[PDB]
Amino acid sequence: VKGIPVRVALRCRPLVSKEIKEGCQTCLSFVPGEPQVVVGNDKSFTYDFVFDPSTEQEEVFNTAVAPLIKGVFKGYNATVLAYGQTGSGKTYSMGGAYTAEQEHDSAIGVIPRVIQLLFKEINKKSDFEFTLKVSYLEIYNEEILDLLCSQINIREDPKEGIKIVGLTEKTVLVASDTVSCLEQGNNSRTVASTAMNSQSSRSHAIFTISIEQRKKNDKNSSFRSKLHLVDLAGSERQKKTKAEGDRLREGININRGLLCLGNVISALGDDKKGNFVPYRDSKLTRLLQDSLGGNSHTLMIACVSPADSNLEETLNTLRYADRARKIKNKPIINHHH
Ligand SMILES: Nc1ncnc2c1ncn2[C@@H]1O[C@H](COP(=O)(O)OP(=O)(O)NP(=O)(O)O)[C@@H](O)[C@H]1O
Ligand SMILES: [Mg+2]
C-alpha cells in the first residue's frame, strides 16, 4: 500500500438485550492479536484495528484514536467517523449522547476523550498559543440544523472547499466549556425510538473543533486545522424497526444519505486519474469531501452487532469498511502566514 489510506477500526459490540431475547447466536469470531474478523464462520476480513466485544472505550481510544489526535498538533486536519447499522454502537463509541452525568465514567466515548487529550497536549506545548472553536451540526431529513441553537446552506468557495453558511461556532477556552458544547448539542440532537434502538439517532452529527496553533517567538506563522468527529446515522429496515409515519420518513432519508456515502466510498476505493466521485449527491457527502479522499488523516470506526439475525447488515458494513481502507487521502500541514 502506497500513500496515506483511510484507516479502519472494526468495533464489535456485545450482544444486546433484543438479540438475547430473540435467541441469537454470535456470528463473528476474532483471531487473537491479529486485526482480523471471521463472519458467518466462513468469510474473513482484515482491518487496521479489530476490537472485539470485550474492548473497553479507553482501549479503543488509546489504540486507534489518540495517535490521530496528536497529529493535529503537527498541523493536520483529522476526522473520526462511526459507521454501521442502527443499534451497532456508533453513538456509544463516539460519545454522541454524552451528558455531564458521564463525566469520570469509564464508559465515555471518543469525543469527550478527544477533548481531554487536546487540553493535556496544549498544557504541554508551553511554547505555543492556541485558539480552539467548536461547531456542532446535524443533518436531519436533508436539512443542516445547528445543534448549538436553543436556514443553513452549503456554498463551495472556489478556493479551499466547502463553507456552511449560517452555522454558528463557539470559541472555547478550557476543557470544561469545550465539553459543555458537546452536552449542549447532544440535548438538541434528534433522537427517537425504534424497535432496533430506543435511542436511535435520527440524524448524522458532526462535531468540529477548529484549532489554531502559533509559536510564541514566531507569531506571523501558525497552523490552522479542523478535527471532524462524526456520529453518522445508521442503516435501518422497516421490517425490524416497525417505524411508521415521521419515524419511517426519517429512516428513509437516513438510508438514502448512507447510499450516497457508500457510492463515495466505492468510487474512492478504486480511484485513479479521471475518476469521478459523487460527493455532490448528498449534503452528508459534501461535508465529508476532505475526510474521504482529501486533506485529512481519517479513521473510520465501523460498528457491528455480533448477532446472527444481523448477518446481512454486518456483512454490508464489513464490505464497505474493507473498501474504505483503499481510499487514499492527502493530508498536508495546514500552514497559515
Ligand atoms: N461496546 C458496547 N458495549 C456495551 N453496550 C453497547 C456498546 N455499543 C453499543 N452499546 C449499546 O447498544 C445500544 C445501541 O447503541 P448506539 O450507540 O445508540 O447505536 P447506534 O449505532 O448509534 N444506532 P443508531 O443511532 O440508531 O443508528 C445502546 O443502548 C448502547 O449503550
Ligand atoms: Mg446513534
Side-chain angles (χ1 to χ4, degrees), residues 44-55 57-76:
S44 92
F45 292 82
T46 301
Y47 304 100
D48 299 287
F49 313 91
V50 174
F51 298 127
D52 86 291
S54 67
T55 311
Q57 299 278 59
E58 189 174 15
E59 186 175 356
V60 173
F61 180 82
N62 286 334
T63 300
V65 184
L68 185 65
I69 305 306
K70 292 172 182 179
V72 311
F73 295 97
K74 299 179 183 170
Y76 293 111

Short mmCIF file of all heavy atoms in Angstrom, two decimals, residues 44-76, unseen atoms left out:
data_model
loop_
_atom_site.label_atom_id
_atom_site.label_comp_id
_atom_site.label_asym_id
_atom_site.label_seq_id
_atom_site.Cartn_x
_atom_site.Cartn_y
_atom_site.Cartn_z
N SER A 44 -13.48 -13.96 5.89
CA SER A 44 -12.61 -13.25 6.81
C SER A 44 -12.27 -11.87 6.24
O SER A 44 -12.10 -11.70 5.04
CB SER A 44 -11.36 -14.07 7.12
OG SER A 44 -10.33 -13.76 6.24
N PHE A 45 -12.23 -10.88 7.12
CA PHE A 45 -11.86 -9.53 6.72
C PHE A 45 -10.68 -9.05 7.58
O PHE A 45 -10.53 -9.45 8.73
CB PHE A 45 -13.05 -8.59 6.87
CG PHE A 45 -14.18 -8.85 5.91
CD1 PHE A 45 -15.11 -9.84 6.15
CD2 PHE A 45 -14.32 -8.07 4.78
CE1 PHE A 45 -16.18 -10.04 5.29
CE2 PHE A 45 -15.37 -8.26 3.90
CZ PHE A 45 -16.30 -9.25 4.16
N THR A 46 -9.84 -8.18 7.01
CA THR A 46 -8.72 -7.61 7.75
C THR A 46 -8.84 -6.08 7.76
O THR A 46 -9.23 -5.46 6.75
CB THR A 46 -7.38 -8.02 7.10
OG1 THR A 46 -7.28 -9.45 7.10
CG2 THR A 46 -6.21 -7.46 7.85
N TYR A 47 -8.59 -5.49 8.92
CA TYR A 47 -8.64 -4.04 9.07
C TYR A 47 -7.37 -3.54 9.74
O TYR A 47 -6.43 -4.29 9.97
CB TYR A 47 -9.92 -3.61 9.81
CG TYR A 47 -11.15 -4.11 9.13
CD1 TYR A 47 -11.82 -5.26 9.59
CD2 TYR A 47 -11.61 -3.51 7.96
CE1 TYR A 47 -12.94 -5.74 8.94
CE2 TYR A 47 -12.73 -3.99 7.29
CZ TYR A 47 -13.39 -5.10 7.78
OH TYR A 47 -14.48 -5.57 7.09
N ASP A 48 -7.31 -2.25 10.05
CA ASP A 48 -6.12 -1.72 10.73
C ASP A 48 -6.18 -2.03 12.22
O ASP A 48 -5.14 -2.26 12.83
CB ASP A 48 -6.04 -0.21 10.47
CG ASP A 48 -5.90 0.09 9.01
OD1 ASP A 48 -4.80 -0.17 8.48
OD2 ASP A 48 -6.89 0.52 8.38
N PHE A 49 -7.39 -2.06 12.78
CA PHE A 49 -7.65 -2.49 14.14
C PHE A 49 -8.92 -3.32 14.15
O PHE A 49 -9.84 -3.03 13.39
CB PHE A 49 -7.86 -1.29 15.08
CG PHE A 49 -6.85 -0.21 14.91
CD1 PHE A 49 -7.07 0.82 14.04
CD2 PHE A 49 -5.67 -0.22 15.65
CE1 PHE A 49 -6.15 1.84 13.89
CE2 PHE A 49 -4.73 0.80 15.50
CZ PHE A 49 -4.98 1.83 14.63
N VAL A 50 -8.97 -4.33 15.02
CA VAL A 50 -10.20 -5.04 15.30
C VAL A 50 -10.39 -5.09 16.80
O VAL A 50 -9.52 -5.55 17.54
CB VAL A 50 -10.23 -6.45 14.66
CG1 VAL A 50 -11.50 -7.19 15.11
CG2 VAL A 50 -10.23 -6.32 13.15
N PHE A 51 -11.53 -4.58 17.24
CA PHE A 51 -11.86 -4.54 18.64
C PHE A 51 -13.08 -5.44 18.93
O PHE A 51 -14.20 -5.16 18.52
CB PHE A 51 -12.16 -3.10 19.05
CG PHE A 51 -10.99 -2.15 18.89
CD1 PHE A 51 -11.13 -0.96 18.17
CD2 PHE A 51 -9.77 -2.42 19.48
CE1 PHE A 51 -10.05 -0.09 18.03
CE2 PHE A 51 -8.71 -1.54 19.36
CZ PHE A 51 -8.85 -0.38 18.63
N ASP A 52 -12.83 -6.53 19.65
CA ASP A 52 -13.91 -7.47 19.99
C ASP A 52 -14.83 -6.89 21.08
O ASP A 52 -14.57 -5.82 21.65
CB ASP A 52 -13.30 -8.79 20.47
CG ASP A 52 -12.98 -8.75 21.94
OD1 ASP A 52 -12.08 -8.04 22.30
OD2 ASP A 52 -13.69 -9.39 22.76
N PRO A 53 -15.93 -7.59 21.39
CA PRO A 53 -16.88 -7.09 22.38
C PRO A 53 -16.33 -6.78 23.78
O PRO A 53 -16.95 -6.02 24.51
CB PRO A 53 -17.92 -8.21 22.44
CG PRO A 53 -17.89 -8.80 21.07
CD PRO A 53 -16.44 -8.79 20.71
N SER A 54 -15.19 -7.31 24.16
CA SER A 54 -14.66 -7.01 25.47
C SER A 54 -13.87 -5.69 25.52
O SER A 54 -13.42 -5.29 26.60
CB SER A 54 -13.76 -8.13 25.95
OG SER A 54 -12.61 -8.21 25.16
N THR A 55 -13.64 -5.07 24.37
CA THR A 55 -12.73 -3.93 24.28
C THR A 55 -13.40 -2.71 24.89
O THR A 55 -14.51 -2.30 24.48
CB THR A 55 -12.29 -3.60 22.84
OG1 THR A 55 -11.82 -4.76 22.15
CG2 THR A 55 -11.11 -2.58 22.88
N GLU A 56 -12.75 -2.18 25.92
CA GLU A 56 -13.24 -1.01 26.62
C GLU A 56 -13.06 0.28 25.81
O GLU A 56 -12.17 0.37 24.97
CB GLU A 56 -12.51 -0.87 27.95
N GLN A 57 -13.86 1.29 26.14
CA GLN A 57 -13.75 2.59 25.47
C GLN A 57 -12.32 3.15 25.50
O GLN A 57 -11.81 3.70 24.51
CB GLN A 57 -14.67 3.59 26.14
CG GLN A 57 -16.16 3.22 26.11
CD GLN A 57 -16.82 3.58 24.81
OE1 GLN A 57 -16.42 3.12 23.75
NE2 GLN A 57 -17.84 4.44 24.88
N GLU A 58 -11.68 3.05 26.66
CA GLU A 58 -10.33 3.57 26.80
C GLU A 58 -9.33 2.93 25.84
O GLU A 58 -8.41 3.61 25.37
CB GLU A 58 -9.84 3.46 28.25
CG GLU A 58 -8.52 4.17 28.52
CD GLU A 58 -8.12 4.17 29.99
OE1 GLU A 58 -8.70 3.40 30.78
OE2 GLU A 58 -7.22 4.95 30.36
N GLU A 59 -9.49 1.63 25.58
CA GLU A 59 -8.60 0.91 24.68
C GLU A 59 -8.85 1.30 23.24
O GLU A 59 -7.89 1.52 22.50
CB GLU A 59 -8.70 -0.60 24.86
CG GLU A 59 -7.67 -1.34 24.01
CD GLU A 59 -7.64 -2.84 24.24
OE1 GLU A 59 -8.36 -3.36 25.13
OE2 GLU A 59 -6.88 -3.52 23.51
N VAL A 60 -10.12 1.41 22.85
CA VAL A 60 -10.43 1.89 21.51
C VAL A 60 -9.77 3.25 21.30
O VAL A 60 -9.11 3.48 20.30
CB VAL A 60 -11.93 2.03 21.25
CG1 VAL A 60 -12.18 2.70 19.90
CG2 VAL A 60 -12.62 0.67 21.37
N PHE A 61 -9.94 4.14 22.26
CA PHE A 61 -9.37 5.48 22.12
C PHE A 61 -7.84 5.50 22.08
O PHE A 61 -7.22 6.08 21.16
CB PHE A 61 -9.89 6.40 23.23
CG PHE A 61 -9.35 7.79 23.13
CD1 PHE A 61 -9.92 8.71 22.28
CD2 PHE A 61 -8.27 8.17 23.90
CE1 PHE A 61 -9.40 10.00 22.18
CE2 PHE A 61 -7.75 9.46 23.82
CZ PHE A 61 -8.32 10.36 22.95
N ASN A 62 -7.21 4.86 23.06
CA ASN A 62 -5.76 4.89 23.16
C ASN A 62 -5.05 4.21 22.00
O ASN A 62 -3.99 4.67 21.56
CB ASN A 62 -5.28 4.30 24.47
CG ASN A 62 -5.52 5.22 25.65
OD1 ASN A 62 -5.59 6.43 25.50
ND2 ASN A 62 -5.63 4.64 26.81
N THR A 63 -5.63 3.13 21.49
CA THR A 63 -5.00 2.37 20.40
C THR A 63 -5.20 2.97 19.02
O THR A 63 -4.24 3.12 18.27
CB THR A 63 -5.52 0.92 20.41
OG1 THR A 63 -5.18 0.34 21.67
CG2 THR A 63 -4.93 0.10 19.26
N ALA A 64 -6.44 3.36 18.71
CA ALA A 64 -6.80 3.80 17.36
C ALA A 64 -6.94 5.31 17.18
O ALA A 64 -6.67 5.82 16.11
CB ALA A 64 -8.09 3.14 16.93
N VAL A 65 -7.39 6.03 18.21
CA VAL A 65 -7.78 7.43 18.06
C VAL A 65 -6.67 8.40 18.49
O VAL A 65 -6.39 9.37 17.79
CB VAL A 65 -9.06 7.75 18.86
CG1 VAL A 65 -9.54 9.19 18.62
CG2 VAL A 65 -10.18 6.81 18.48
N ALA A 66 -6.09 8.16 19.67
CA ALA A 66 -5.10 9.08 20.25
C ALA A 66 -3.97 9.48 19.32
O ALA A 66 -3.63 10.68 19.26
CB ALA A 66 -4.55 8.56 21.58
N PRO A 67 -3.36 8.51 18.62
CA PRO A 67 -2.29 8.84 17.68
C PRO A 67 -2.71 9.81 16.58
O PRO A 67 -1.93 10.71 16.20
CB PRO A 67 -1.88 7.48 17.10
CG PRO A 67 -2.23 6.50 18.17
CD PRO A 67 -3.51 7.05 18.76
N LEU A 68 -3.94 9.67 16.13
CA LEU A 68 -4.54 10.58 15.17
C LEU A 68 -4.72 11.99 15.72
O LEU A 68 -4.40 12.98 15.06
CB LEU A 68 -5.90 9.99 14.77
CG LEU A 68 -6.69 10.68 13.69
CD1 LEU A 68 -5.94 10.60 12.38
CD2 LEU A 68 -8.07 10.03 13.57
N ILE A 69 -5.25 12.09 16.94
CA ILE A 69 -5.48 13.37 17.58
C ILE A 69 -4.16 14.10 17.79
O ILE A 69 -4.06 15.31 17.57
CB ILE A 69 -6.21 13.21 18.94
CG1 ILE A 69 -7.51 12.43 18.76
CG2 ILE A 69 -6.53 14.57 19.56
CD1 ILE A 69 -8.44 13.00 17.71
N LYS A 70 -3.14 13.38 18.23
CA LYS A 70 -1.83 14.01 18.39
C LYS A 70 -1.30 14.62 17.07
O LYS A 70 -0.57 15.63 17.10
CB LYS A 70 -0.85 13.02 19.00
CG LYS A 70 -1.18 12.68 20.46
CD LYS A 70 -0.27 11.56 20.94
CE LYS A 70 -0.59 11.14 22.36
NZ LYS A 70 0.28 10.03 22.82
N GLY A 71 -1.72 14.07 15.93
CA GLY A 71 -1.37 14.62 14.61
C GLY A 71 -1.91 16.02 14.35
O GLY A 71 -1.35 16.76 13.55
N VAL A 72 -3.01 16.41 15.01
CA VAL A 72 -3.50 17.78 14.82
C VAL A 72 -2.48 18.79 15.33
O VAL A 72 -2.41 19.91 14.82
CB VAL A 72 -4.90 18.07 15.44
CG1 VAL A 72 -5.90 17.00 15.03
CG2 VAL A 72 -4.84 18.22 16.94
N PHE A 73 -1.68 18.41 16.32
CA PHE A 73 -0.65 19.31 16.81
C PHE A 73 0.54 19.49 15.87
O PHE A 73 1.33 20.43 16.05
CB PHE A 73 -0.23 18.89 18.21
CG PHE A 73 -1.32 19.05 19.19
CD1 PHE A 73 -2.12 17.97 19.55
CD2 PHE A 73 -1.60 20.30 19.71
CE1 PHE A 73 -3.15 18.15 20.46
CE2 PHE A 73 -2.62 20.48 20.61
CZ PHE A 73 -3.40 19.41 20.99
N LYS A 74 0.65 18.62 14.87
CA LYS A 74 1.56 18.84 13.74
C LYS A 74 0.99 19.76 12.65
O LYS A 74 1.71 20.15 11.73
CB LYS A 74 2.00 17.51 13.13
CG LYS A 74 2.76 16.63 14.11
CD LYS A 74 3.16 15.31 13.50
CE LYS A 74 3.85 14.43 14.54
NZ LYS A 74 4.01 13.06 14.00
N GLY A 75 -0.31 20.06 12.72
CA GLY A 75 -0.98 20.97 11.79
C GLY A 75 -1.89 20.26 10.81
O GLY A 75 -2.32 20.86 9.82
N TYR A 76 -2.22 18.99 11.09
CA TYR A 76 -3.08 18.23 10.18
C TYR A 76 -4.53 18.41 10.54
O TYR A 76 -4.88 18.62 11.71
CB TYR A 76 -2.77 16.73 10.23
CG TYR A 76 -1.41 16.36 9.69
CD1 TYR A 76 -0.41 15.89 10.53
CD2 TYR A 76 -1.11 16.48 8.34
CE1 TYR A 76 0.84 15.55 10.03
CE2 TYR A 76 0.13 16.14 7.84
CZ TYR A 76 1.10 15.68 8.68
OH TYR A 76 2.32 15.33 8.16
#
